[PDB]
RNA sequence: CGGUCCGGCCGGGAACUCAAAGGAGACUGCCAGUGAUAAACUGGAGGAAGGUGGGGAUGACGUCAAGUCAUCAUGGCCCUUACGACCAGGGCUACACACGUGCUACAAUGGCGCAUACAAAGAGAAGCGACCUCGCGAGAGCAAGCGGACCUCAUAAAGUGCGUCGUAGUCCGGAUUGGAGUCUGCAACUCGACUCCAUGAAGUCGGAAUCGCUAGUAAUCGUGGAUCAGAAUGCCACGGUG
């Protein structure tokens, strides 16, 4: 089987990604798993606005690191090299777990 | 219920009142019961005279009292002969250790002395 | 300091940013630097041209760089001649392989930093600074922007007494988050100090 | 302080200098900005002018100075009083 | 033929299941007596149940994660009333009466910057 | 407030006994929000002292509590050149609510070891009716018809 | 910060990149409980031979664009200020204000 | 459901908890009373939520010639064999004193010892580092697993149960100091943190004065992160009890 990890900061630009992904392997092999999604991360961040000094005056930032986890049950032949060249869109971060 | 030079508090029990020796804590007072065979939670009251000979030889194998103070001061006024820092710190009344003389060094300097 | 960049408060909403890539934590500052130096050299060697927002984007290591400017014939000159100029020197900043892509920007006068260089180069060499924003106000309602306020701000005419100064024509809500403003700031370096120009426009509301 | 897996401290090219007076048996000051090496016990008996941030101040060495460090023995801050 | 019902309290998620019974409290494959030492806690846990007449008539079993001893105690009574509304239905005329039904939405307030709690503010001086 | 009068919140009543006004003394008891603690003072306390009456616990309690309920307190109005300390009487939910705030404060300054010895102790002369809790209950009684002339 | 400041900065990540397999090597030996004694005073005298420079604490992490030593963040290279004009005009991705 | 090493562990099961993505939901929308036939207000009705449900972000024109030329940028002035640059050592940590902000206390709603229950949110590759062994201990050795809903940091503490102290400067309090160490780091003297043994100050609730807080709030209890080789009682987050 193939664990695949989707890693991104827009979630509506891996859902774009994920049913893409799906796609591919649904035409090509057969059972692809499901779009299971994963806990996405939130590093937050807090840092001084003013140059000189204000403590108290402050932003507070975060990312969200979007997670998304498909698996495909049955490799066929078509289903890792024709996936293995398309080609996702940037912000999407693809990571094959071969068996 | 006079051990080592001193008295010792018949009321209280085995451990408590063995820390009023000069030199033995409350870790120190758990090893020598256990090397006389003695429970913490008896008193000094209802001891066998013979468990407090055998508790007068247990003290004996450390420094205490007379001993320690004698070393203590030794190694202060070792300090004291040297002229290093920490000599300096012990003989101007200063904190040793390294700690905040700006500000809250009552211990060392006693209280405040103001300014006249 | 009581306004919130408008920009960077959108961001989720309405705004895209100008960065989209992912990296982990091990490369992400590398990327931050790779992206800021090719902005450092785009907008020293395209002043002439009127660049507005350079995106950068990175698939499967290799840089896509997308400049937006209001006439692309100074950005290409003969047919692959600038460009490929300037795609070989980002894959020696970058070091990754490269690719330039130009988007028009279709009327300039409703961008907020074509219009605050516009002020900008006008303020640089020696003009009235009302006038200057008085033909940046009346060009962008013209061209059918639903509100714009610009400002400029310090050392006015070489006065000692540096004040700000703002017109707005069409109304600009910066509470509204929906809001489109495009909010952009430039700076003239004069001879009597620096002059700050800060300029928003609104569109119009993203219906989303 | 320092584990004693390591060892002690001294400065290479102080504990040259300290093989060469042993050996040389000269008594002249010697002037040191390792205020961070520990004595040696070969060391005793022998002037050595440890830094203090301004000048150099001579230390005669003891016998019970072995075990501390050279800046213990040159202080960096002068303090006479208030009043 | 299990009737269920979800509990939710500060950070607790109750997991009730009803069977009618004899009144057999089963939390985390523990007893209630053994589970709840606080009193307090045992007695939220039987409210619903002593509210209508029916401690004898059915048993359940329960588990419960995360939150504290009374917030895991408070989920588990909103399961049960959101359970046994699933067994009668005629109980939600008096379980909302009761103040049971309504999932209490207190939850802990964040750090803000400056405050040094959610609301308490560093000690001032003028001079 | 100055804009509305507002709806209070609701209280538990006691697990042992069924008593809203217990668990409502177990609350000015606790300290630091330990109510675990303090459950188990009252519990502790009130065990002896229907001990030393032969009562309920409920009813024993409400005897303390009937000798220290105050009847007319006075507050501070100011509208001369100096402070009027006018008698106002107090609403029964106050009466109540004052009377086991000076049965507590009490109980801490007693010299018992434990709390709930210096509680029963100070619950058990509230209802012989001496005490520094009755004591608080005159010292108001008594500034009270110092100061009836203010109405 | 100044340029010398900053040049500084580059020749302690140059130093620390050169030596970096050789003081490995001398903490083997010195770290070694089962080593010869000698040895492990001869190795804790070689690492004073080498530059101060070069070791890893010796560096401290100023901002990418302006050398500023304090308010880094590890993350994103950058002084807490350089950060906030970034993630405002977005060249940092995925970076917004938080509520929550 | 079946099976068991009684462990969701293992066949499995997709319900449930949960994880996100999308959507529904609350609008004075309805009912009654008041109101100037209005705005609106009061009440109850359903409902998880009722009138802004709770919390955050969001800070008008301006004010204080407020703050910052030491993040950066920049007009003008100044220095250019020094006001620039390099290195070692020192200092930024001094100490008759005055103030701010905090931490721990003055104990019995507690200290202590044993046993035991319940969290959330995070970080991790020059990193997090199980298990096992050694050490009283901080730690050391060997060393899995992990770029992480997997593994690790990491056993939550307050609590409860039992025993203990029995009002004392105490089995309260922990300063100070001596001795012995560990770890980080070229290097812990000035000037680090931590551990062990010993030591056991002041302090018995605080003058005039003064601060915070309206509900999961104050109070109290632990947890994590940023910075960082190491180095918080600060700061930023998190849940428990309440
Ligand atoms: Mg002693
Ligand atoms: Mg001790
Ligand atoms: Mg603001
Ligand atoms: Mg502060
Ligand atoms: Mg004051
Ligand atoms: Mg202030
Ligand atoms: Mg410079
Ligand atoms: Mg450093
Ligand atoms: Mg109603
Ligand atoms: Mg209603
Ligand atoms: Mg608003
Ligand atoms: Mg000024
Ligand atoms: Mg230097
Ligand atoms: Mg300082
Ligand atoms: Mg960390
Ligand atoms: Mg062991
Ligand atoms: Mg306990
Ligand atoms: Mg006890
Ligand atoms: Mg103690
Ligand atoms: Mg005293
Ligand atoms: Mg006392
Ligand atoms: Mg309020
Ligand atoms: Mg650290
Ligand atoms: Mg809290």
């Keep these: 089987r193939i664990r695949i990890r989707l890693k991104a900061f827009d979630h509506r630009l891996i859902d774009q990604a994920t049913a893409e992904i799906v796609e591919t392997a649904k035409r090509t092999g057969a059972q692809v798993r499901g779009p299971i999604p994963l806990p996405t991360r939130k590093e937050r961040f807090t840092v001084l606005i003013s ?42 971060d693809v990571q094959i777990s071969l068996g | 219920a006079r051990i080592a030079g001193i008295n010792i508090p018949d009321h209280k029990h085995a451990v408590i009142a063995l820390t009023s020796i000069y030199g033995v804590g409350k870790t120190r007072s758990k090893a020598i019961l256990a090397a006389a065979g003695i429970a913490e939670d008896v008193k000094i009251s209802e001891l066998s005279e013979g468990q407090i000979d055998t508790l007068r030889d247990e003290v004996a194998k450390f420094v205490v009292e007379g001993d320690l103070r004698r070393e203590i001061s030794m190694s202060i006024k070792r300090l004291m002969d040297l002229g290093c820092y920490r000599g300096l710190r012990h003989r101007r009344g200063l904190p040793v250790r390294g700690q905040r003389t700006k500000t809250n060094a009552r211990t060392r300097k006693g209280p405040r002395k103001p300014i006249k | 300091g009581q306004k919130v960049h408008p920009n960077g408060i959108r961001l989720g909403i309405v705004k895209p940013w100008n960065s989209t890539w992912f990296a982990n934590t091990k490369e992400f500052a590398d990327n931050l630097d790779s992206d800021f130096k090719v902005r450092q050299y785009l907008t020293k060697e395209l002043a002439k041209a009127s660049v507005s927002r350079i995106v950068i984007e990175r698939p499967a290591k290799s840089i896509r760089v997308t400049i937006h400017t209001a006439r692309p014939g ?49 303020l640089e060499r020696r003009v009235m600074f009302r ?70 426009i609104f569109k119009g509301e993203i219906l989303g | 302080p320092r584990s004693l897996k390591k060892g002690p401290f001294i400065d290479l090219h102080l504990l040259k200098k300290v093989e060469k007076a042993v050996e040389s048996g000269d008594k002249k000051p010697l002037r040191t900005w390792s205020r961070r090496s520990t004595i040696f016990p070969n060391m005793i008996g022998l ?37 | 033929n299990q009737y269920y019902g979800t509990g939710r309290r500060k950070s ?25 030492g606080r009193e307090t806690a045992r007695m939220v846990v ?82 | 407030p100055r804009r509305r009068v507002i709806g209070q919140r609701k209280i538990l009543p006691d697990p042992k006994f069924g008593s809203e006004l217990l668990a409502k003394f177990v609350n000015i008891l606790m300290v630091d929000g330990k109510k675990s603690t303090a459950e188990s003072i009252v519990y502790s ?37 100096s402070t009027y300390q006018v008698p106002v009487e107090v609403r029964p939910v106050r009466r109540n609510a004052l009377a086991m705030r000076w049965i507590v404060e009490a109980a801490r300054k007693r010299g018992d070891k434990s709390m709930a010895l210096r509680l029963a102790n100070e619950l058990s002369d509230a209802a012989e009716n001496k005490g520094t809790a009755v004591k608080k209950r005159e010292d108001v009684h008594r500034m009270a018809e110092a100061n009836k002339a203010f109405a | 910060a100044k340029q010398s400041m900053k040049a500084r900065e580059v020749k302690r990540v140059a130093l620390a990149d050169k030596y970096f397999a050789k003081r490995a090597e001398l903490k083997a030996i010195i770290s070694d409980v089962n080593a010869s004694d000698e040895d492990r005073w001869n190795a804790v005298l070689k690492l004073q031979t080498l530059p101060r420079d070069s070791s890893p604490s010796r560096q401290r992490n100023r901002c990418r664009q302006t050398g500023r030593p304090h308010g880094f963040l590890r993350k994103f290279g950058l002084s807490r200020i350089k950060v906030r004009e970034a993630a405002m005009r977005g060249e940092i991705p995925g970076l917004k204000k938080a509520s929550w």
């Excluded at chain 4, 301004?54 to 019970?64: A, G, M, N, S």
């Excluded at chain 5, 009144?23 to 709840?36: D, P």
């Design chain 1, 51 to 92: 140059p000189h000094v204000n403590k108290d005056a402050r932003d507070q930032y975060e990312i969200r690191t979007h997670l998304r986890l498909v698996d495909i049950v049955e490799p066929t032949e078509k289903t890792v090299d024709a996936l293995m060249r398309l080609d996702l869109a940037a912000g999407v």
């Design chain 6, 45 to 81: 306390a009130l065990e002896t002292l229907a001990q030393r009456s032969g009562k309920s616990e409920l009813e024993a309690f409400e005897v303390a509590l009937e000798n220290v309920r105050p009847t007319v307190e006075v507050k501070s109005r100011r509208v001369g050149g």
């Design chain 4, 47 to 83: 002037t050595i002018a440890v830094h203090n941030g301004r000048q150099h101040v001579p230390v005669f060495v003891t016998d019970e100075m072995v075990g501390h460090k050279l800046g213990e023995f040159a202080p960096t801050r002068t303090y006479r009083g208030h009043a």
């Design chain 5, 12 to 36: 607790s998620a109750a997991r009730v299941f009803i069977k009618p019974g004899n009144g057999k409290i089963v939390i985390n494959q523990r007893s209630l007596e053994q589970y709840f």
């Design chain 3, 74 to 122: 100074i950005v290409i000159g003969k047919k692959g001649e600038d460009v490929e100029k300037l795609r070989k020197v980002v894959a020696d900043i970058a070091g990754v392989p490269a690719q330039i892509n130009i988007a028009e920007v279709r009327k300039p006068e409703l961008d907020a930093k074509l219009v605050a260089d516009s002020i900008t180069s006008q």
């Design chain 3, 131 to 200: 006038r200057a924003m008085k033909r940046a106000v009346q060009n962008a309602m013209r061209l059918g922007a639903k509100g714009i306020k610009v400002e400029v701000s310090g050392r006015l005419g070489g006065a000692e007494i540096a004040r700000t100064e703002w017109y707005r024509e069409g109304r600009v809500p910066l509470h509204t988050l929906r809001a489109d403003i495009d909010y952009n700031t430039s700076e003239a370096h004069t001879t009597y100090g620096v002059i700050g120009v800060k300029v928003w």
């Design chain 5, 46 to 127: 039987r409210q619903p149940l002593e509210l209508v007449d029916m401690v004898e008539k059915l048993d359940l079993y329960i588990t419960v994660k995360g939150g504290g001893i009374s917030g895991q105690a408070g989920a588990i009574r909103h399961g049960i009333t959101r359970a046994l509304m699933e067994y009668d239905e005629s109980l939600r005329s008096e379980l909302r009466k009761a103040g049971f039904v309504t999932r209490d939405a207190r939850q802990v307030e964040r750090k803000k910057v400056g405050l040094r709690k959610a609301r308490r503010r560093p000690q001032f001086s003028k001079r």
